[PDB]
Amino acid sequence: EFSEECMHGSGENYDGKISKTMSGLECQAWDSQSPHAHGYIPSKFPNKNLKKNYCRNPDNDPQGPWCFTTDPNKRWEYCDIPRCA
Numbered sequence: 001e002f003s004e005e006c007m008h009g010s011g012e013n014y015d016g017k018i019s020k021t022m023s024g025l026e027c028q029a030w031d032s033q034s035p036h037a038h039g040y041i042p043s044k045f046p047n048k049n050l051k052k053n054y055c056r057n058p059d060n061d062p063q064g065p066w067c068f069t070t071d072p073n074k075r076w077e078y079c080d081i082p083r084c085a
């Protein structure tokens with residue numbers, strides 16, 4: 001069965017487990033506020049699937065999923081999620 005290996009379009013419905021940015025940084029967890037404080041709180045929009053530190057696209061960015069990063073000097077970065085054929 002399908003296991004979230006790719007995203008449809010820009011990934012508003014992506015629910016896979018990639019947790020590293022394009023440059024290879026580990027993502028910050030959505031339920032954490034350090035190193036970056038933010039307002040993408042999982043409980044505020046459960047259907048946005050903001051789980052663990054997985055790359056997601058909760059602001060409908062046309063470039064696709066991203067995460068806050070664990071680098072204290074890089075707030076966020078896109079991830080490399082392949083688009084489904």
Ligand SMILES: NCCCCCC(=O)O
Pocket residue numbers: 038039059061066075076
């Ligand atoms: N469009 C991807 C980055 C969105 C970052 C929003 C923020 O700084 O809280």
